[PDB]
Amino acid sequence: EEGRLTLAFSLHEVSRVLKDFLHDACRGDLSRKSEDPWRDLFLWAVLQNRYEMATYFWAMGREGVAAALAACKIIKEMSHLEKEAEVARTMREAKYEQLALDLFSECYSNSEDRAFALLVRRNHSWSRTTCLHLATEADAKAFFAHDGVQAFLTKIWWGDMATGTPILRLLGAFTCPALIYTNLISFFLLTRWRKFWGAPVTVFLGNVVMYFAFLFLFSYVLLVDFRPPPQGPSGSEVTLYFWVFTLVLEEIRQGFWNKCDMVAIFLFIVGVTCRMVPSVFEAGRTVLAIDFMVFTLRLIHIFAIHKQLGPKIIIVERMMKDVFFFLFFLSVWLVAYGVTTQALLHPDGRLEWIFRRVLYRPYLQIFGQIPLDEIDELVTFLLVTNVLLMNLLIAMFSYTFQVVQGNADMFWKFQRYHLIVEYHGRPALAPPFILLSHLSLVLKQVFPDPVDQKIITWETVQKENFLSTMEKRRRDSEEEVLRKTAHRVDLIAKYIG
Amino acid sequence: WNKCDMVAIFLFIVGVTCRMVPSVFEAGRTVLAIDFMVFTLRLIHIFAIHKQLGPKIIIVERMMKDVFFFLFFLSVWLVAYGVTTQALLHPDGRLEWIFRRVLYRPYLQIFGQIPLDEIDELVTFLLVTNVLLMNLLIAMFSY
Amino acid sequence: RDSEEEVLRKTAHRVDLIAKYIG
């Protein structure tokens, strides 16, 4: 109807439905036989939700996982668009991701090298795109949890001695630029240089070093920023122009914890604006002071790369939201207790001193600062009630995170993939050298078939092997065997009678 | 423990060498001082013989490696908090005193030493964030 | 030998054989 208004089915019509759904760089004689009929029929069967016919159509499909993931995306699309909630759920119970994962596991166990070539492949049946682009497009989280995925991620993460690389040895070798030529650590001069300085792990190490050095230098310069005659000294502007510009440039370029990212962006602009105003020196310092914890906060999340520190941050992100109101209520209770002891302890007229003796003194009493010279010229029940409240506070967190950790594992796997692809797409240069890298990029802007087919065939073989295996398992199903044998018993008994 | 064995062997030789030099008396004492904890460290592992104390040391050896970077990051955060309160609290020129008021005073504040005569003429959010970080630290080892 | 699952499978096979014989 929209097509007729802009000018009952047509080829362009269904092609537009496609483009609307896969949202990929894929477009499109009634007598002309259409290439790859199996793809088309499988597509329709998914659209018509003809599950079994769809799986069969796939059974002759050429490239399994690509089609399976595209289908998964398409059902994830339709299930929400479905009006009938029960029909929506029955749609949402397709689980093609399981089938794609199984096929990929089989091709993994078989070769684990041709399997990788499969994973990094271009499917003409799907407008020549890599399967990973599909998984991203389809949010194939569970598939990402597969060992082959993480394996290829690790391989693209290193590129030189990926499986084995001691952390203490990697850093010691990076310390000297000729360790690769020294052959002490695994890796003509320009080639080895580009290799040692073109790897995602190396870009990560370099960016982390630059970030730590920036965080330290700016903290040191905050001392001079503390007492300049006007708000904001020269060195502060130096470090600003040297780091903030590059950081914001890289961030906006990538764009064109998330609440933490937002307050991070905001505090720096607020600090720049406060430094613009010399009259408010106290504010010109306080804004930057509140800001500077941002880089540490960001750094914290920057620690999810390696296995052990991985899940923790994820788990930390899990309990990040619920902790707010709990701490709010606990602080309300503590403030009530402080006001109570302050009132009973002594029957004033000072704002700063009133707020101080109301909040800092009892807070420091929790921190071992009990000035009896200023306090001493039910309460035990209050202490035990506070102890019980603390016990409940501890027992909440100690029992809550255990449940989330399960899904948090696969979620961290996903986030690790994100970080890896980002670092790979991240320019190798450090934030100071990022200026030179962006300048070089701007200047540059100013200035097979047989092996692929063999892998296709091998993969299809793997598919039929897995199918025959599943079928033989279904045959040997002990419960079905017992039921069929009972039926045969009943038949033979009726015959004997 | 084998790294502990290595540093054990090394510290004693370093102490003997420092004692050979009489000019560096402060060093001649400091090396032996850093050393002497070695025998206790070794003794600790010497306690795996009998049933109950058996597994513990083993478990202790398990979490020995991962604890390093975690404590490093936690110390970085604590140092950041100390520098923040030190900056906001007071706008110097002393090396020893600067490092002291930067590291020992906030460390002793965790240990019940809060000299309000030298501190008093968001922060609650900072305290609860530290509490949550400590909860995560505990829940890591406990699980 | 006394494996209950294998016993059940072999007995089912014997059932099928005896049923084919009765037919």
Residue A314 near residue A411, CB atoms below 8 Å: yes
Cα(A293)–Cα(B130) distance, integer angstroms: 13
The encoded tokens of residue A192 equal 């080895």
Residue A199: closest CA among A172, A182, A174:
A174
* The one-letter amino acid at A367: F
8-state DSSP, A241? I
Q: Is C21 touching A (CB cutoff 8 A)?
A: no
The encoded tokens of residue A461 equal 């073989």
Instruction: Classify the C-alpha dihedral A50-A56-A58-A64 as positive or negative.
Output: positive
CA dihedral A91, A93, A96, A99 (to 10 degrees): -150
Radius of gyration over every alpha carbon of chain C, rounded to an integer in angstroms: 10
Cα(A167)–Cα(A153) distance, integer angstroms: 18
Q: Is A226 touching B (CB cutoff 8 A)?
A: yes
- Report the residue from A481, A491, A496 with minimal CB separation from C12: A481
Cα(A158)–Cα(A117) distance, integer angstroms: 17
Cα(A142)–Cα(B86) distance, integer angstroms: 47
Residue A450: closest CA among A458, A441, A462, A442:
A458
Of the CA atoms within 13 Å of residue A54, those in its CB half-sphere come to 21
Cα(B29)–Cα(B42) distance, integer angstroms: 21
Instruction: Classify the C-alpha dihedral A248-A250-A254-A257 as positive or negative.
Output: negative
Cα(A264)–Cα(A136) distance, integer angstroms: 27
Paired with A129 in beta bridges are: A123
Indicate which technique resolved this structure: cryo-EM
8-state DSSP, A62? S
Cα(A199)–Cα(A184) distance, integer angstroms: 19
- Report the residue from A219, A360, A367 with minimal CB separation from B112: A367
Count of positions (residues) in chain C: 23
Instruction: Classify the C-alpha dihedral A142-A147-A151-A152 as positive or negative.
Output: negative
Cα(A443)–Cα(A243) distance, integer angstroms: 22
* The one-letter amino acid at B96: E
For residue A203, give every residue at least 6 positions away whose Cβ sits within 8 Å of its Cβ, in sequence order, or none.
Answer: A423, A426, A427, A428
Residue A190 near residue A414, CB atoms below 8 Å: no
Cα(A72)–Cα(A141) distance, integer angstroms: 12
Q: Is C5 touching A (CB cutoff 8 A)?
A: yes
The encoded tokens of residue A440 equal 């070089």
Residue A117: closest CA among A52, A181, A65, A67:
A65
Cα(A326)–Cα(B135) distance, integer angstroms: 14
Paired with A123 in beta bridges are: A129
Residue A159 near residue A186, CB atoms below 8 Å: no
Alpha helix positions (H), A111-164: 114-119, 131-138, 141-144, 147-157
For residue A454, give every residue at least 6 positions away whose Cβ sits within 8 Å of its Cβ, in sequence order, or none.
Answer: none
Residue A211 near residue A202, CB atoms below 8 Å: no
Do the Cβ atoms of C19 and A481 come within 8 Å? no
For residue B138, give every residue at least 6 positions away whose Cβ sits within 8 Å of its Cβ, in sequence order, or none.
Answer: A398
- Taking each helix axis as running N to C, give the angle between helix A51-59 and helix A64-81, from 0 to 180 degrees, rounded to the nearest 10: 160
Residue A455 near residue A121, CB atoms below 8 Å: yes
Q: Which residues of B touch A400 (CB under 8 A)?
A: none
The encoded tokens of residue B33 equal 């001082």
Alpha helix positions (H), A346-430: 351-366, 372-375, 379-425
Q: Is C17 touching A (CB cutoff 8 A)?
A: no
Q: How far is A316 from chain B (nearest CA, A)?
A: 7
The encoded tokens of residue A61 equal 């499909």
Residue A200 near residue A157, CB atoms below 8 Å: yes
Do the Cβ atoms of A485 and C15 come within 8 Å? yes
CA dihedral B16, B20, B24, B27 (to 10 degrees): 0
Report in angstroms the alpha-carbon separations of A140 from A109, A136, A236, A361, A421: 20, 6, 45, 53, 15
Phi, psi (rounded to 5 degrees) for B62 = -65, -55
- Report the residue from B66, B116, B136 with minimal CB separation from A308: B66
- Report the residue from A482, A485, A495 with minimal CB separation from C22: A495
Paired with A352 in beta bridges are: none
Residue A58: closest CA among A455, A452, A467:
A467
- Distance of alpha carbon A303 from the chain centroid: 13
Paired with C19 in beta bridges are: none
The encoded tokens of residue A336 equal 């009530």
Residue A149: closest CA among A164, A134, A160, A161:
A134
